[PDB]
Structure 1
Amino acid sequence: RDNMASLIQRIARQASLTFREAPMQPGFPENLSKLKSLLTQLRAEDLNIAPRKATPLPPNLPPVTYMHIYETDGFSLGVFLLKSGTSIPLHDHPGMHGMLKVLYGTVRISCMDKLDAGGGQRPRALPPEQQFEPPLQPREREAVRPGVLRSRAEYTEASGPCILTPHRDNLHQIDAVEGPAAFLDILAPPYDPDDGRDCHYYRVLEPVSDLPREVWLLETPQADDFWCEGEPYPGPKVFP
């Protein structure tokens, strides 16, 4: 069709409309569904990203890299590229909406939430006799929170986009399965560590089993061996 912008430009426009009057323009549910529809059409070749295959990882190379596409105050738009056998560790997205689309390879995504009384749960404190492996230091026991592990599935470019909300599937872990993988990620609002909106990491405690099952979650510092460095984005530019 004549004069159509690139798909990635149109994704960026729609995320901007989604996450920021006669006739009435779309509301949030309609805009979210349109954003989702655009992401379902996106292929790696639309970003000029050749699928990557396996090559031992030198200790100085990042396990994961990041391609910056665009960002505003409303959203961030970029690509994460995982090397073989790497993992984006379990983390949350506080108060955020998220949408991701696998471009190549296969990822295991585990989706979780911390219990929230605003949803009709009655979150309880960890019981004192409940023990774990490894055992919990006293300051760690006080910091444990209950949560629920909702799903743990493999996703490829043929899967629908994966969506999260402030209150549903807000925690996830992404493991690269059977070689390298990459996905396009939209986050809204973006992280802002200077304004106290950081990426928080977690571990699921193993005590002393189908889904969904309740679990115990402990926040933890970013792992020593996890870091994500930028690399050039080769696809169509998002203007301006």
Structure 2
Amino acid sequence: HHSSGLVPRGSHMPYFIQRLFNTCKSSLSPNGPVSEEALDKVRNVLEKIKPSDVGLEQEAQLVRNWLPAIKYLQLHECDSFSIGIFCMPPGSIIPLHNHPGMTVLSKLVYGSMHVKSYDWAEPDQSELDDPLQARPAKLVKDIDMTSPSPATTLYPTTGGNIHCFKAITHCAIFDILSPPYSSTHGRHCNYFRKSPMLDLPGEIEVMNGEVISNVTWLEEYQPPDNFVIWRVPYRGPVIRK
């Protein structure tokens, strides 16, 4: 029945993070995902993620034993995409920011957090208006998420390109970005605040006649000073690149 070790199987299924990296390399480009089918292929692998796949099995146990500093682990950065993990202790915050021209696939690896996200009410006015003045945005998501929760996707103008996170328990957010942030290519991680201007309307009529209700007015701004985030080495299974 068995060869007693003489004939091992070999060419085994690459372990999770290797499989995931391999698929990103084939599914992603400097222009973003190659296709929705291609992006779905990355999404199908990412959904199965476990804390042990990325060396976070110990931190995941802090969830059961339930501003503060956030740890950021960079697993890969190339012109085509980046992979990173935010390890957030309870009560920490990733302040409101956007992902210009970018698609981001994200997965809560463990724990619970709150996400609030918006999109501009008039995406076509991005290149024609001053980002330092108040601009109308529509609410997309405003909800707690608790692992296991399906992977989420934001696009350059839909799915909540402007978002913020607040950790409820210890949690880790696994992010795949294509294209990656690049201050050189005009793709900066810009932060935003609610406009303190008084007389801004709650609803508007935009191009077509569509009435956008519950508008939120956002000003570009420097990130808050209590946002402490430290770069930390990835200590999980190695990626063969």
Could you say which residue in structure 2 is the equivalent of 1:7? 16
Give the equivalent residue in structure 1 for 2:165.
174
Cα distance, 1:194 vs structure 2:
4.1
Structure 2 CA distance, aligned partners of 1:117 and 1:101? Answer: 26
Residues 64 and 230 of structure 1: is their aligned pair in 2 closer, same or farther, counting only changes over 3 Å?
Answer: same
- Corresponding position: 1:40 with 2:44: no
Residue pairs, 1:153-232, within 5 angstroms:
153-168=143-158, 169-177=160-168, 179-205=169-195, 213-232=214-233
Provide the rounded CA distance (Å) in 2 between the counterparts of 1:91 and 1:30. 27
Paired residues for 1:1-240 under 5 Å:
2-20=11-29, 28-49=35-56, 50=58, 51=60, 53=62, 63-116=69-122, 118=124, 143-168=133-158, 169-177=160-168, 179-205=169-195, 213-240=214-241
1:53 is displaced (CA, Å) by 2.7
Q: Which moved more, 1:6-15 or 1:86-95?
A: 6-15
Q: Which has the bigger relative contact order, CA under 8 A and spacing at least 6? A: 1
Q: What whole-Å deviation, never above 9, does each CA across 1:34-78 have from its counterpart, x for those lacking one?
A: 1111111111121121215389x7xxxx62111111121111001
Structure-2 change in CA distance of 1:191 and 1:52 (3 Å): farther
Is 2:101–2:187's contact at 8 Å kept on the other side of the alignment? no
1:218–1:37 Cα change, 3 Å: same
Q: What residue identity is the alignment partner of 1:40?
A: E
TM-score (norm 1): 0.78
Alpha-carbon distance change, 48 to 28 in structure 1, aligned in 2, over 3 angstroms: same
4+ residue stretches of structure 1 with deviation over 4 A? 206-209
- Letter of the 1:218 partner, please give it: E
What is the aligned residue count?
Answer: 209
SS state at 1:42 partner: coil
| TM-score calculated relative to the size of structure 2 | 0.78
* CA–CA separation in structure 2 for the residues paired with 1:3 and 1:40: 21
Deviation sequence 1:6-54 (CA, Å, 0-9, x none): 111111121222212xxxxx96111111111111111112112121538
Change (3 A) 1:212 1:12: farther
Q: What percent identity do the matched residue pairs reach? A: 31
Question: 1:221 & 1:205 partners in 2: Cα distance?
Answer: 13
- Give the superposition deviation at 1:150: 1.3
Query: Structure 1 residues 145 and 76, CA, compared in 2 at 3 Å: closer, same or farther?
Result: same
Give unpaired runs (5+ residues) of structure 2: 1-8, 203-211
